[PDB]
Curated annotation (Swiss-Prot):
Ranges for domain TLDc: 6-179
Function: GTPase-activating protein (GAP) for Rab35 which regulates synaptic vesicle (SV) protein recycling and turnover at the neuromuscular junction boutons and possibly ventral nerve cord via endosomal trafficking. Inhibits Rab35-mediated endosomal sorting which traffics old or dysfunctional SV proteins through a degradative endolysosomal route that involves the ESCRT pathway and the HOPS complex members dor, vps39 and rab7.
Protein origin, superkingdom: Eukaryota
This protein's name: GTPase-activating protein skywalker
Tissue specificity field: Detected in the larval ventral nerve cord and neuromuscular junction boutons (at protein level).
Gene it is expressed from: sky
Documented effect of changing G137R: In sky-1; embryonic lethal
Domain characteristics, as noted in the entry: The Rab-GAP TBC domain is essential for phosphoinositide binding.
Cellular compartments annotated: Cytoplasmic vesicle, Secretory vesicle, Synaptic vesicle membrane; Endosome membrane
Residues making up the signal peptide according to the UniProt record: none
Amino acid sequence: KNFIKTWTDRQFLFTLWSWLPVRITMYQPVLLYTTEEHGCSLTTFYVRVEQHEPTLLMIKTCNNEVFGAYCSSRWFERNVKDDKGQRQAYFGTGETFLFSLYPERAKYPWVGIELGHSSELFMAADSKMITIGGGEGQAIWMDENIRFGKTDSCKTFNNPPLCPSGDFEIRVLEVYGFVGI
């Protein structure tokens, strides 16, 4: 409705807005998937989000930590094969970035914005897990039930664990897309 209600209901988006790529800030964010309404499985997650790009992933843990990632590419691309016919694990571009809102508040861009293959590992997903940020650790990792997950330092984003404990339980997961071509 009005400005106050819109801001109140979507505070985390308005806090994040200035971190998005500048061209994206001119589009309208739309809720693609929420564990509060749409099921709670990678299978229903893919069906709803996989042809959108870019997307914004927001995790609220049962420990009241809030973090997530801007994802450059459609999750549909998780199954792309190279020219040998071997499925590619990691996909995406260097516009992908991690963020945390609570307890800390930080943006971890790709370390190559200013190297090796292992610092260019953005997104990966299959029937057992979805992960973001790879290379000697996984920045965000979540299981097929979107119930439990882990977080670690990774070399693509040189981040710390986005919550103090290395693990978390998901209270709610939200995915936003962008419309307005």
